[PDB]
Amino acid sequence: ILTIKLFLLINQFEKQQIKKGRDITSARIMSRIIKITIIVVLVLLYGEHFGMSLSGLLTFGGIGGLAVGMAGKDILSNFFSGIMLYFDRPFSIGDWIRSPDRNIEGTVAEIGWRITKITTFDNRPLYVPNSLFSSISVENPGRMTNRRITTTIGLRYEDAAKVGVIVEAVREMLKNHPAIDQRQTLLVYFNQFADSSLNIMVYCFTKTTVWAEWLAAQQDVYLKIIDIVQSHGADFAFPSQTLYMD
Amino acid sequence: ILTIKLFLLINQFEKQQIKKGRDITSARIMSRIIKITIIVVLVLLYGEHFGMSLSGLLTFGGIGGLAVGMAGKDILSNFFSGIMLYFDRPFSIGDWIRSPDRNIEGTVAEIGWRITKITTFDNRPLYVPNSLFSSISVENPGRMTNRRITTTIGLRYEDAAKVGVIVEAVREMLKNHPAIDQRQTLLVYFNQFADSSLNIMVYCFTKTTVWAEWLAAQQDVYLKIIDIVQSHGADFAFPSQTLYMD
Ligand SMILES: CCCCCCCCCCCC
Ligand SMILES: CCCCCCCCCCCC
Ligand SMILES: CCCCCCCCCCCC
Ligand SMILES: CCCCCCCCCCCC
Ligand SMILES: CCCCCCCCCCCC
Ligand SMILES: CCCCCCCCCCCC
Ligand SMILES: CCCCCCCCCCCC
Ligand SMILES: CCCCCCCCCCCC
Ligand SMILES: CCCCCCCCCCCC
Ligand SMILES: CCCCCCCCCCCC
Ligand SMILES: CCCCCCCCCCCC
Ligand SMILES: CCCCCCCCCCCC
Ligand SMILES: CCCCCCCCCCCC
Ligand SMILES: CCCCCCCCCCCC
């Protein structure tokens, strides 16, 4: 009676799946697989009150279950990581995230039970297995507090006598700029010797976190830097070489 | 009687396989393998009602099954991932897919139980084991909503006084173009200092998602950009060097 009821349930499931609008042969194969595994489970369970062997059945069931357990590790890992994300996740729907270990950069769209759906900046869907979030570091640029501006000013080696005044002028301009966060790091210093130029580092932050406003402020700062450099008699350096003719 | 029936079934299977048009010796070897494993299973199962040892049989069967379970992990993994794809797959037949972790780029042709068949853009078949889709991120360019246009304009360092007007003109042209999606990101800004040029970024989207129309729109935009740049008295920059002669 139990077998008949289970077979009726499987047949009803197959009929509903076909009604849902899917392939015939695939549905039949799935039904056959479910029937086979149901029979195996019943035999492993009812192999004593009806069957005779004990040690053989125990060993066969044990080895089968051991193989099944080893084979299905990844799907179960995805499911468990989905549960963990449901209880504790370091992001929300609509958050821009990325990682230094894998390529998952984009905006979160859906958090499912097996995979997480992410919309890339190319406007494409990306499906990430949930088990990744248990082993990689996740960064959340969607929750930043400031945008950083960094650049390098490369002056010619003949302009070594103007580095101090140029650095002072650039620092003053950055200190008096209305778009720069004065409570963050602000560094302008002659930093290193390069192959063809003397490099000056620039390091600051903007109050805004919006893409377009940050880009506009950066462009304004760069143009002001160009004006400052050219007003003191210095100039930017191309790659340079010394040639001995023969 | 059970052994005789099983051997008859195996012989019938071998005869049918030969009738299907395959090698003789291979069929005989497969039949021998199936016979050997059937005998082993029967001995492990019927080793008490006929046999005598219990602990030895249990240990032998356990170690054999443990080795078999470890060895057959990958095939079972492929089968289980095929089942999971049957129930939940992030693509359909005819979808263009790719991945940042492996090389699987192409169009989906068949989704089998062990492998998935993909037609590459080289017009070649590619067979991907199903277990890959449980551990790698899958991207679906076949479901995009827009095509992105990105490029860089590199002006000479002597054209620093025209960057603002050139950026304004390019932004206006992009805003008035009939092929550009005005509801998406649209950025044109002086972006960075390069070794030989001042770089301007361009970032926009097209309404269409068709390959040929996107390429045509991109070509039109590039030609318009060239005209805009050359009309303001600026020019594109070749790689540059400063040479000191001796
Ligand atoms: C009408 C809903 C039918 C749902 C069928 C679920 C089948 C689960 C099989 C589990 C085998 C261990
Ligand atoms: C062609 C449809 C029937 C395929 C049956 C496959 C059975 C595989 C059994 C493997 C036992 C280790
Ligand atoms: C035609 C359907 C064939 C289904 C075969 C299922 C075989 C499962 C083998 C599991 C080994 C542990
Ligand atoms: C929406 C219905 C989900 C049904 C899941 C069935 C799982 C069958 C597992 C078979 C393992 C051999
Ligand atoms: C129509 C399908 C014929 C082949 C079925 C093979 C079933 C093998 C089950 C093995 C369980 C361990
Ligand atoms: C082998 C383990 C399979 C586990 C499948 C769990 C599916 C849960 C889905 C819940 C929402 C549909
Ligand atoms: C099987 C995996 C279960 C994971 C459970 C995680 C529970 C986290 C609780 C955090 C509370 C703030
Ligand atoms: C006429 C169809 C014959 C199918 C033979 C299947 C053999 C399965 C062997 C399983 C050994 C555990
Ligand atoms: C040449 C045809 C017969 C080959 C027999 C190989 C048997 C290998 C047994 C290994 C036991 C560990
Ligand atoms: C000529 C056919 C030889 C077949 C040999 C099968 C040996 C199986 C060894 C399995 C060890 C666990
Ligand atoms: C289409 C017929 C499929 C038959 C599959 C037989 C599998 C034999 C497994 C032997 C393991 C030692
Ligand atoms: C014609 C084949 C002769 C060799 C057969 C060797 C069988 C070894 C079986 C080992 C089972 C563990
Ligand atoms: C060692 C495990 C082998 C499992 C083989 C399953 C084959 C299923 C095929 C169903 C469609 C032909
Ligand atoms: C042995 C692997 C079984 C995998 C079953 C996955 C079930 C997913 C259900 C999703 C419903 C939308």
Residue numbers in the entry:
A (entry chain B), B (entry chain A): 89 to 334
Quote the original article:
To prevent cell lysis, bacteria have mechanosensitive channels that are gated in response to the elevated membrane tension and release solutes, restoring the turgor within the cells. One of the medium-sized paralogues is called YnaI, with 5 TM helices. The TM paddles are in contact with the surrounding membrane and are therefore responsible for sensing the membrane tension, while the vestibule with the pore formed by the TM3 helices conveys conductivity and selectivity.
Closed YnaI was purified for structure determination by electron cryo-microscopy in n-dodecyl-β-maltoside (DDM) supplemented with 0.5 mg/ml Azolectin (condition I+ ), resulting in a 2.2 Å map. The model built from residues 3–334 resembled the one of YnaI purified in LMNG by Hu et al. with minor differences in the outermost TM helix (TM(−2)), which is frame shifted by 3 residues. In our model, Trp29 in TM(−2) is at the cytosolic interface of the membrane. We found that each sensor paddle has four TM helices that are interconnected by 1-2 hydrogen bonds to the adjacent paddle helix. For example, Asn8 in TM(−2) makes a hydrogen bond with Tyr63 in TM(−1). This hydrogen bonding network suggests that the whole paddle forms a rigid entity within the membrane. In the closed but not open conformation, the pore lining Met158 interacts with Met158 of one adjacent subunit and with Lys161 of the other adjacent subunit.
